Amino acid sequence: TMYICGDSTECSNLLLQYGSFCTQLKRALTGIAVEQDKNTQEVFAQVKQ
Amino acid sequence: FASVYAWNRKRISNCVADYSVLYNLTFKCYGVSPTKLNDLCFTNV
Amino acid sequence: LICAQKFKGLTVLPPLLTDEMIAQYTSALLAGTICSG
Amino acid sequence: QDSLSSTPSALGKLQDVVNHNAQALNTLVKQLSSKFGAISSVLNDIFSRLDKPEAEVQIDRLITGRLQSLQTYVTQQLIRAAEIRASANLAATKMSEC
Amino acid sequence: FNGLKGTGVLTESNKKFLPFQQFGRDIADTTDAVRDPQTLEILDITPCS
16 A cells, blocks of 8 residues: 555545455465465474474 | 737746636636646746 | 665565574584484 | 685575565566656645546556556566475475485 | 655755755655755655654
């Protein structure tokens, strides 16, 4: 919302009419972020000791 | 007023532009709204 | 430039495991590898 | 140490990961200056100079263009993530077997 | 500021504007510094937390 409309209140309201694009973008990035920590532990955390 | 073949240009500068009178008395604005001129600044008119 | 991006709504999240923690895992692997094969 | 120290390209594999993500963010920011046919990239003047129904038209152009940019960014990140995941899996395999 | 409108924090700038420059811009062509129309003091503009 900040990327697109900045500090414009009127734009922020207009943006709400364009669908769930923003929700989809936020969950895609969230999924990637989680995966990156998983990758690290798979490589290094192979010892319980 | 000047003839159209020899139109006259008057420069407006270093002043406060009160446009209410022009609204108060054909009035077509291009690229700008006639009701927002009260809150704009220009380098020259 | 990090701030220039921060002022446009683009940020960066920290890793769960810090560099010190990954060094500890590596050290454990080396200690094992050398002393117990 | 001598081999790595005297060969800047030796760690190109890790430097490229850093460079690619840094560039992606800088590109995403620069795209904000694009107008996509709009009279201005700045929402605030479009509102100050134009009327309501007029500003809405100019803004729709800007919103559409910026949504297209964000979608492009995410798509590329998903593709890159797939490549890194494969590399991480190989590294994990080597840790176990080597 | 002289017609420019926005929301943010105004701080003292260390940007040496030339005698004829009224404002500066960032890499996204957005103003991040202005000259005060009365005091000629240069101010930096940043987003609020």
